[PDB]
Amino acid sequence: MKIFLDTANIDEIRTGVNWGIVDGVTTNPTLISKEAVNGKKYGDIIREILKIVDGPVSVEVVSTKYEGMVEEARKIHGLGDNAVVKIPMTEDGLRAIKTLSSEHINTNCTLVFNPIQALLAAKAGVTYVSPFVGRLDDIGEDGMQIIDMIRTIFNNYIIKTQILVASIRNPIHVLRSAVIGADVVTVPFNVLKSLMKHPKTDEGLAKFLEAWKKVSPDGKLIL
Amino acid sequence: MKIFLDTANIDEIRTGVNWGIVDGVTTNPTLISKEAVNGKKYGDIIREILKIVDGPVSVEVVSTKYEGMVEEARKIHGLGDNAVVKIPMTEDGLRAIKTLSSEHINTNCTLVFNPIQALLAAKAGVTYVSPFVGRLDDIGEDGMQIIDMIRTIFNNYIIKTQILVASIRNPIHVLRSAVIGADVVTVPFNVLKSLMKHPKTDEGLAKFLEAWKKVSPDGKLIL
Amino acid sequence: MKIFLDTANIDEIRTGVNWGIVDGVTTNPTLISKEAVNGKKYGDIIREILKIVDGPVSVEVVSTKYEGMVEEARKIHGLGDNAVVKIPMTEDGLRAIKTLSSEHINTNCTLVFNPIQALLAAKAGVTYVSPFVGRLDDIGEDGMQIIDMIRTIFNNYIIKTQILVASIRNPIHVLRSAVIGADVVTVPFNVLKSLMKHPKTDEGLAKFLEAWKKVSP
Amino acid sequence: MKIFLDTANIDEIRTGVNWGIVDGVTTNPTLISKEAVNGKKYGDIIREILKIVDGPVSVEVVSTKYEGMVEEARKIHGLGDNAVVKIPMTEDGLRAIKTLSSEHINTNCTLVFNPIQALLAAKAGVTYVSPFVGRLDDIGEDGMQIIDMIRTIFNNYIIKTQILVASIRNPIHVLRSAVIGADVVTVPFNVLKSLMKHPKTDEGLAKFLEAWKKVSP
Amino acid sequence: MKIFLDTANIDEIRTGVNWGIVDGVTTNPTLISKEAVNGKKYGDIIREILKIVDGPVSVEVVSTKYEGMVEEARKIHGLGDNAVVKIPMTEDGLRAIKTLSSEHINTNCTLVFNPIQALLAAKAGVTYVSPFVGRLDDIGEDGMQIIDMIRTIFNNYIIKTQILVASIRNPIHVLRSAVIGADVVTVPFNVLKSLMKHPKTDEGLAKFLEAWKKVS
Amino acid sequence: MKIFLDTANIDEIRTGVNWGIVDGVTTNPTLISKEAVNGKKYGDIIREILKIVDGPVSVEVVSTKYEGMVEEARKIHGLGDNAVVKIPMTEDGLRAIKTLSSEHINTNCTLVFNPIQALLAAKAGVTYVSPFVGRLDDIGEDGMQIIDMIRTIFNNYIIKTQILVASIRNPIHVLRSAVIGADVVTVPFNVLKSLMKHPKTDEGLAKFLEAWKKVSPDGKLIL
Amino acid sequence: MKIFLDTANIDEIRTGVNWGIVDGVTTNPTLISKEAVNGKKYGDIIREILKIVDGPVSVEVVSTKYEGMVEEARKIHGLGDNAVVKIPMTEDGLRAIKTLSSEHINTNCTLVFNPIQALLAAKAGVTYVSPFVGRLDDIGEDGMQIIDMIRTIFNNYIIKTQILVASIRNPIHVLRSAVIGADVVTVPFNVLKSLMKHPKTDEGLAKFLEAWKKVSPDGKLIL
Amino acid sequence: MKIFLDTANIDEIRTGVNWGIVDGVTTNPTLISKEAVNGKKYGDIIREILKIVDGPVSVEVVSTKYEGMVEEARKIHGLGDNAVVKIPMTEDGLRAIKTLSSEHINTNCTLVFNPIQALLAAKAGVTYVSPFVGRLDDIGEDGMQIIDMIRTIFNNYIIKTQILVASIRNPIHVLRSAVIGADVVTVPFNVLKSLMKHPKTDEGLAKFLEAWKKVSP
Numbered sequence A, B, F, G: 001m002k003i004f005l006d007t008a009n010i011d012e013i014r015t016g017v018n019w020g021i022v023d024g025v026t027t028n029p030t031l032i033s034k035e036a037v038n039g040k041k042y043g044d045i046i047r048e049i050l051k052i053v054d055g056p057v058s059v060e061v062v063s064t065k066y067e068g069m070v071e072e073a074r075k076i077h078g079l080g081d082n083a084v085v086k087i088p089m090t091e092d093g094l095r096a097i098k099t100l101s102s103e104h105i106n107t108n109c110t111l112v113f114n115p116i117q118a119l120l121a122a123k124a125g126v127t128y129v130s131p132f133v134g135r136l137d138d139i140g141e142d143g144m145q146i147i148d149m150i151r152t153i154f155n156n157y158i159i160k161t162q163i164l165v166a167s168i169r170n171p172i173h174v175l176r177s178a179v180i181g182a183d184v185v186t187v188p189f190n191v192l193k194s195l196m197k198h199p200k201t202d203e204g205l206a207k208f209l210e211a212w213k214k215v216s217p218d219g220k221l222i223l
Numbered sequence C, D, H: 001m002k003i004f005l006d007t008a009n010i011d012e013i014r015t016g017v018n019w020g021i022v023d024g025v026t027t028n029p030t031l032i033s034k035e036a037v038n039g040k041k042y043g044d045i046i047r048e049i050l051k052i053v054d055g056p057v058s059v060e061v062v063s064t065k066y067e068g069m070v071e072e073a074r075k076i077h078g079l080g081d082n083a084v085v086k087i088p089m090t091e092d093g094l095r096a097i098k099t100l101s102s103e104h105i106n107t108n109c110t111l112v113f114n115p116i117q118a119l120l121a122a123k124a125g126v127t128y129v130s131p132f133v134g135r136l137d138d139i140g141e142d143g144m145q146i147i148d149m150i151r152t153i154f155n156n157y158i159i160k161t162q163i164l165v166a167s168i169r170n171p172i173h174v175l176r177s178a179v180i181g182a183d184v185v186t187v188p189f190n191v192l193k194s195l196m197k198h199p200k201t202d203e204g205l206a207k208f209l210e211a212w213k214k215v216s217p
Numbered sequence E: 001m002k003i004f005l006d007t008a009n010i011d012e013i014r015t016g017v018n019w020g021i022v023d024g025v026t027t028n029p030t031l032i033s034k035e036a037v038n039g040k041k042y043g044d045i046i047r048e049i050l051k052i053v054d055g056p057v058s059v060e061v062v063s064t065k066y067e068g069m070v071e072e073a074r075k076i077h078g079l080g081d082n083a084v085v086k087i088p089m090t091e092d093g094l095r096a097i098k099t100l101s102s103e104h105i106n107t108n109c110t111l112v113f114n115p116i117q118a119l120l121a122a123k124a125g126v127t128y129v130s131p132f133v134g135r136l137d138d139i140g141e142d143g144m145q146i147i148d149m150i151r152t153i154f155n156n157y158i159i160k161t162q163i164l165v166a167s168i169r170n171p172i173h174v175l176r177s178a179v180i181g182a183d184v185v186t187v188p189f190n191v192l193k194s195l196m197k198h199p200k201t202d203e204g205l206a207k208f209l210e211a212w213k214k215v216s
């Protein structure tokens, strides 16, 4: 399972990449607007993320019409080969995915909330599809059940579109995604950081330290 | 999963093909008769649909006897190589499917209401079998359970006949067909258009448009 | 399981009542506005249904504020004892239900789309809660799964609010509702008409008639 | 589970009542007209069965309209207190069942092929409902699934209508009915006889006889 | 679950009755023809079993016809109030069970091999029904599955007939009967003795012994 | 299922109670410290919540020793009959619950993370037990599974201690709690507010409004 | 679920009783022999445990023959009315249980390793049956599955013998026993103390203490 | 499934190796510090184990920082080709594993307590991951459920990291690990010793010996 960071905060992205556990980044207009404050331009933020991340970087069109979408997608693709164009699940978005797929431009279909929307995006040729589990949780439906159905459907037809679980809110979204077999999760930085941690890991490290001081007062392994 | 349009309405077909999510079309005598009004003749309708649709176009015979069915089927086949001849599940229909199968004329067995009818159509060599889920629902049995049994039977024997779910009435027939792994669904136009829609998709677009306007007064992505 | 008719069409209601299988009626503002045309007044339509139907008849408030809902609910209640006041699942609606329940005015909470909304309506004291299965099907979620969860939740807490399955589109919504154990279904007229029918019933009647004609022409 | 005989053949009925495992009888116009031959009349056949069978005896109306159904039913009822009026699942039949139940006349709703038809018959007050499992098998659906759903639905609503499994064709329809918990099965005579039999029973009787002769010639 | 001994052997019955865990006895014509050899008469063997065993003791008729079975059953009844008359699953057996039930004579229907035979016996009023699990195992059918179905059917109809699992061959027939909830099992003596034993019981006794010898 | 509000913010508590959907409140030292800023005293905050909430109000001891715990619990009980004393799962806490139970003071055992801790608190006589589902989610275990086991255990022994699901983070914690059959959930205000809402409720209200304007231009129901 | 302490160590028993979560005590000849050293005699140990523990105290006979077991059991019964006589699953033990049952002397059948042994002990009238889960685990079969089958058998026949899970080695034997619905567990002291503990409980205490110090410098709740 | 011995006790390791059933050894700082007493030096203990054991031998770094872990790992690797460097699941540990994996130094990620930590270690390229089942049991969670999830996750993504079940306390951890399909278990000596044994094995040997003594005294 690939793990992407879902943010536009450059500091978070730098830190996650240095742990070596971040395989890419997803952005959206809200995440970018959060960082385009106090002089910082959205164009510079996007270019910078593409620079520092070796994996895929998803960047969303802002046009809602077919022609604006494919025009902006070709501009986004032009910025770096790791750019992936995020496109919403709409009539015009499906048309844009089909065109861009034929042009060998990688695409990510976003704002997906049920399995048949995800299948429609796969049939248009999309590279990734992003179902939003946290926003389903918000409206009182267990969002992970949609991921489970998409995985089954994609397995049934040997679909090569990658399932990219998005709107992740907690580590159990991540655990359940891995058990189901989703291709990718994209996670906020706070969630990323929590995935490495466990209180028994902490306790065990402290007990090992104390036992080793019995045999080596300076606490080193001299071999 | 392939998605066919279940209509003889030229505008619906043109619209859905323009969307890029329609892989073919199924008709029947009732659907054609509803459009063959105010001067239009059934032969114009069929030829025009064959022209618009690149994928399979299923066209039903009206004869009930073997010789008439095979004669009709060869005429239908002559209208275009994407024509598929729709034949009912009857003794003379099975005989006709076996004859036409040997002539490499593609066939679609219709009016199928249980799994063993579907198996017999596959054994006659039919290209597609069309169980009618909505008409089973009408008589108080869950039609999707027949699709599930057909999928299992066909998997058991590596049957190459495609399961073409028909009499579809709502998007959950479509969801369940995909989770089962049916090869094709054929859907009325009202159903097709609904498949792309979700209220959280609309809500999410509106929020992203608002976030975009905070960083770009005009509303145009400049990269 | 009680079976209600989901329409404001007086002709449908008369026909279904004469068949003996209709236990009540549900309406909503769209259903009424469809009939209240070409001179027909919405007040008359509501009053006519209340007179024809012995069982519960649900009529929806149109106000969105607490005070306006309670005022409208009292006028609806005053139209006949079988009137039930349909109230949407909103903050003001839950307050209104709580007040009307203490006034012993029967209530039906509508526009419910998940099980926790249904639970909230039950906690407000509502007589019926109406989850919409067909509108969930519309958006690619099997609506009957919400009915199954509400039945479990209501059984857990011995909740006396009745589950009234609404937005029904086909007879398998009805079948699944009965197997789950919902208290009520409300069905459109073309669904109601199909529930008595089966092709093997028709075939068996024809065979029995031919058999009888051999012994008594 | 009660066990009824599904026949109009008086010799079968007498033989099976002589076994003491038959709790009642069902008939239909086809079964009666098979035995109404060689100058035998359908009225005498019915009266003879009623006399010989202590249990319920189901006898089908031949009218298709409500008023004819109800007049026939009362005449059937007047033939003996153990008569049960068999009425088809139709709009007129449900109306007739509702009337007859209020008159304390026992009823059996027949030609039922799915669980919601069975529910409608129970809501009309019917004493027994008869889903036809074998005719469902004939058209490629496992008929016993319908029995299982009706048992669940009736349990959900504490329905007192008895499930009377009909159109029975083999002993596994009977076994599955008992495991599900159907109230009654009605079986043809050749199925009834087979229910007592098993090859290991016969083989065991032979070995016990053979061992018995060892110690007692 | 009640536990009966399935034998005509006076020594086995007496030993198991000494252990305090045997609740009743079943016999059959083959079991009794094995003990009625070299000067033993079947009549004495039955009376001695009846006398030793407080609980129910089933004794099978040998007649095949209704009249003979009912007359034999009354002779069996007259032998002791704890006598239970074992009657095979046949037409005349079902008629005899019904008559004997009306006379308040306890009955045990035997040679039952599927659940619907068991149900018919219950409908005739029988006190116990004895499905034969080992003989089903013999012909390649897991006989405990018939017990499970009979339990479900009897539960469905609140049937008061007791399920008496017979033809028991091993301790897992016994375990599965208890997990299903059969009312009674009847077991041969080899099987009965084995039910108390386990090698970890033996090992634990020796270890407690050794530990106690360090203190006394 | 009772629904408590998990906050010490007086405004949130006032608002939730007026919806009539709030059955009580839980607090803890962190939630109270958040509101004891800029002159406001913790004692006044506690007394005020007890005043405005008719249902149970859980207030946590801060002593870690048996004697300090029962002393503070008797003070908390003295403030109002709706006070419930929150006591942590520790050796001294169990001893305190047993004493206070014998004094007919209602208790809530908190900081519970597995089912056997919850059983121990029930055996001491505690009125409520509070397993922390969100903090289990944080450490990569699905916290709702512990609620399911506690419900089973309590059912097995007819335990009268109420299960009060705490550390709730989203509406699916609430949904799963209700399906399991927990006695109580305690929820932050943001979660509470989301429970009433659904996008199809919004859309349906707008459609009903529009249809009614066809028959009543002023949008009233005149009867 | 009742919790007994499985030890003859007086200090452990005193400590665990002081905690209020111990409902009784089980011993055996090995556990007593480990404490009957350095002058202490086995009779002092038993009498002292009987004095400390208000609940049942199980004390094992050492005879292997029926007459010795019943004579020992009457002496044990005379030490105090909370004494329960532990008797092994043997032919003479079953005879002894039946005799003692009639004398209204409470009994505990030990060295039980399968469900039918447990059923036979119940049929002899035993008060408690003690299957040994850890010793089954030692020989490669999951001992808790025997507890599960015993619970089902006893439920089937409304058996009043209490299931007393013994040879407990870890807290998951305890968890599974409670989820199954065993009547009693008996646990070594090391296991008992661990049952209350969880690292997130400790972490949560520490955070609440910190939040408290922000509003109360001394550290005392004043109401 | 490979079976490792989880100890630094040279006598246990010698004994287990001579039995032929030990495929490798795991150690940790507590296990080594227990043996490195009364003159015994930890360097000598590690070197002696590496010589005795043909299979993998895991030895844990004690540094907590990236640079110190990699330096210590290189010294461990240099002690013998069968050495495996045990690295805790921390941020610095994952960086260290990634570097050592690219240097073709085998690694074992330890102190893992849920399935997503195990996945992170696998993504860093670790040769073995060691989830601790017994320490989870300690805190009231069935540790074997984490092994089951990791096996599923690893199967989903065709992960080549081996699952090394650690903190094993009893033979049922071992049984359940094999049924799940874990790659490796590491067991303490008293668990290892019990795996070959069964009381019915012992009893059957005694019976066969008595049988043989009847034909060849």
Ligand SMILES: *[C@@H](CO)[C@@H](O)[C@H](O)[C@H](O)COP(=O)(O)O
Pocket: B006, B026, B027, B028, B058, B086, B108, B110, B111, B130, B132, B134, B135, B164, B166, B167, B168, B186
């Ligand atoms: C041809 C077979 O695929 C189709 O056109 C079918 O006739 C229709 O799908 C049947 O649908 P209705 O039951 O709604 O007529």
Ligand SMILES: *[C@@H](CO)[C@@H](O)[C@H](O)[C@H](O)COP(=O)(O)O
Pocket: C006, C007, C026, C027, C028, C031, C058, C086, C108, C110, C111, C130, C132, C134, C135, C164, C166, C167, C168, C186
């Ligand atoms: C009232 C609630 O019981 C009913 O009239 C509902 O508004 C309708 O059942 C909803 O149906 P549609 O989704 O078909 O509008």
Ligand SMILES: *[C@@H](CO)[C@@H](O)[C@H](O)[C@H](O)COP(=O)(O)O
Pocket: D006, D026, D027, D028, D058, D086, D108, D110, D111, D130, D132, D134, D135, D164, D166, D167, D168, D186
């Ligand atoms: C009356 C309803 O209980 C019965 O006589 C039914 O008509 C028959 O059981 C139907 O059987 P066939 O399907 O074999 O006609």
Ligand SMILES: *[C@@H](CO)[C@@H](O)[C@H](O)[C@H](O)COP(=O)(O)O
Pocket: E006, E026, E027, E028, E058, E086, E110, E111, E130, E132, E134, E135, E164, E166, E167, E168, E186
């Ligand atoms: C009487 C009925 O309970 C019993 O004696 C049975 O005949 C035997 O249990 C049958 O045993 P076999 O199959 O081993 O003969």
Ligand SMILES: *[C@@H](CO)[C@@H](O)[C@H](O)[C@H](O)COP(=O)(O)O
Pocket: G006, G026, G027, G028, G058, G086, G108, G110, G111, G130, G132, G134, G135, G164, G166, G167, G168, G186
């Ligand atoms: C008496 C019966 O409950 C207990 O003391 C048991 O002897 C022990 O629980 C057995 O435990 P070990 O297997 O650890 O000796």
Ligand SMILES: *[C@@H](CO)[C@@H](O)[C@H](O)[C@H](O)COP(=O)(O)O
Pocket: H006, H007, H026, H027, H028, H031, H058, H086, H108, H110, H111, H130, H132, H134, H135, H164, H166, H167, H168, H186
């Ligand atoms: C190394 C990881 O494979 C092992 O030595 C582990 O540290 C131990 O297996 C952990 O065991 P304890 O929980 O018993 O310390």
Ligand SMILES: *[C@H](CO)[C@@H](O)[C@H](O)[C@H](O)COP(=O)(O)O
Pocket: A006, A026, A027, A028, A058, A086, A108, A110, A111, A130, A132, A134, A135, A164, A165, A166, A167, A168, A186
């Ligand atoms: C791109 C789609 O993969 C992502 O940036 C999504 O927009 C976010 O993951 C959505 O998350 P929120 O629901 O929390 O905005």
Ligand SMILES: *[C@H](CO)[C@@H](O)[C@H](O)[C@H](O)COP(=O)(O)O
Pocket: F006, F026, F027, F028, F058, F086, F108, F110, F111, F130, F132, F134, F135, F164, F165, F166, F167, F168, F186
């Ligand atoms: C009292 C226990 O019911 C509550 O106030 C709990 O402390 C909180 O629910 C814990 O939630 P957080 O984990 O989010 O602090």
